Amino acid sequence: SPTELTEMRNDLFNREKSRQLSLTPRTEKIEVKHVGKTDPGTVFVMNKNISTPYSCAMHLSEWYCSKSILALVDGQPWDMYKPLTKSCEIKFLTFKDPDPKEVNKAYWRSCAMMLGCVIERAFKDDYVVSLVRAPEVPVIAGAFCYDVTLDKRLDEWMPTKENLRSFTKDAHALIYRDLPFETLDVDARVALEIFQHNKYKVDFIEEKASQNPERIVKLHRIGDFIDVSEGPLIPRTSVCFQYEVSAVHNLNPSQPNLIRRFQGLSLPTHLRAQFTIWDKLVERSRKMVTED
Amino acid sequence: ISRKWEKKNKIVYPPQLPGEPRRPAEIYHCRRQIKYSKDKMWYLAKMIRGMSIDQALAQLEFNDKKGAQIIKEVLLEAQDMAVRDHNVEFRSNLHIAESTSGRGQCLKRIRYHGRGRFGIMEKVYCHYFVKLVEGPPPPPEVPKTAVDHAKDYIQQLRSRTIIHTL
Amino acid sequence: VYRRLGLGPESRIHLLRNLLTGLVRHERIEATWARADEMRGYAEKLIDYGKLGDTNERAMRMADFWLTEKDLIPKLFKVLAPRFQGQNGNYTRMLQIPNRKEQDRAKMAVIEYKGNYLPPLPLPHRDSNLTLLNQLLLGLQQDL
Amino acid sequence: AAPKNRRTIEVNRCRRRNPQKLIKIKNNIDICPECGHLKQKHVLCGYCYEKVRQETTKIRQQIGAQEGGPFRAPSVETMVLYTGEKPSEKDQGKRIVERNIKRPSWFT
């Protein structure tokens, strides 16, 4: 049963948190200086691997928390809820920054991860659904793409307008739930055990472990659902305001399994869109998206 | 004159036991003498009730009434002591639990008139009372759905008891 | 189509006359929003009179009456008029300023003469095309 | 004409606590990135404007001293120069205002 996999998957996620917490003895104070343009030069003494950038935002004002989606730690993008590691220089990133390219990637990746969660639970337990990977496509493409391999039983089934709406309802429920994006750095050995069943995920885990000298891999968890991430993700699911599953395109060479690439569009609350604009964007997001 | 609002800030709780949740901070601040009407000040107090510290400050900054500026100054003083003396870690983690205005001692004068009449002149003063609870403002009330309303009516009907019988 | 200001219609002209003279001397004046809008139309029309030419007798009469200080008359024909010869309009820029804290809370706005040597006002800037929403629209533009 | 009877506090309380008579909240409040202070969407920031406006007075004070007399408005264009900046050929035939301060970053 799928619940069994989530239960054991959730536990290993919890055990890793305990090991990291046990790894750090006592509370270590790290001096972090605010390099952000606003309120520059403020220095916070923080507990190592215990506090997060959100705590610093709480320290200053609520405006920081609402408008801060990411943090620049020593010039590196850090999640708002990622525990701090050392004394550093911290700056807050907003949706309206001059260069939202780093922010765009995190929003792009987070949307793909959320879509993957919908697919696995959307289908009945009778059918077998295996997620292959989340292809990285530019924002210019007009839609975020997620690839999934279905069971032979679903070879002849194509989503209808109502079925696509059902996926958005699941996505909308997740946004309504407002589940924070948990972040863990896990070794390949543990990650392989967590996702041993899905061979496609296994190779993706191997690639990330291969690139870096260690076996540490980036894992993100939304509630029970867990997935690997190419980079930082959105702090919470409530950020998205508009969500739509534009269309699904079936890859022709899909004999061993039916591989479908799902097209979707989402917009954050900070960036609302007019009714006509969204309709055209959704229409432009129903076209097959190639990777370039 | 009574100054029991300040005494509420001097209350010291017993040391908390290990099996007890971390007590949320409560701060009582007031300005005893303001040359302003309590009734006019009450309108400002009523609107800000239950709002966050930051949200209230933003509204006050763009408020046209003189009392609003005084309220913001009072709010800032309470926040400063809260961190300095009430061990508040986060400045933003504050909300307006209570806000009200009270009467203050006035001054009496005779109001002359150009036509030989006279009147009773009063210089009004008022007190302003606010209690701040550490943490975000509580979530707003959600209106009851039709399902909720119907269930109560049915429950009331079942709860009905026979009257004046064996 | 005309606001009621001052103690009478002639006072409005005198009040408008004083405001116009002050703007020319300094090129940037702050006043109530309602009054600033009323004087904006006159300022633009005056520049047209300046463009007409110094030798124009009507322009000289108009310039003399509206500008109490006569040193400004050479400036209009030799500074203001030459500067805007290329432009066909929109000589004056009016922007909203936070209301006065003078216990009356009147609506405040700043009216300035364009092309001036004064420090640039903090004008609003539209969102950059690098924003996520703008980038998506750019993609639609490229496809079309 | 006086009321036939005193109006009850309960009746009075309802009138003054009616939502129509209560103070309304504003949702158009915005933040100023430049000064880090609050602003309205249709109202420019004032903390930065104070620098520009007060800077203008300093420039105006220099201009007033340079003219030295009433009704002395030049018939030629005027330009402002700060320390470290030297007049160019294009600046020829233009009134020049000299400021001891260095060229401000915001001013271009």
Binding site: E62 | S52, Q55, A58 | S128, L137 | N27
Partner: peptide, 30 residues
Amino acid sequence: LHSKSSTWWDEHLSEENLSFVKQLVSDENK
């Protein structure tokens, strides 16, 4: 602040994108 804000269609539309939007609306109407 987690509070409602006022927005309009032209709030976040750039000058280049704004011109494109006007052309698109005319095309849709036609």
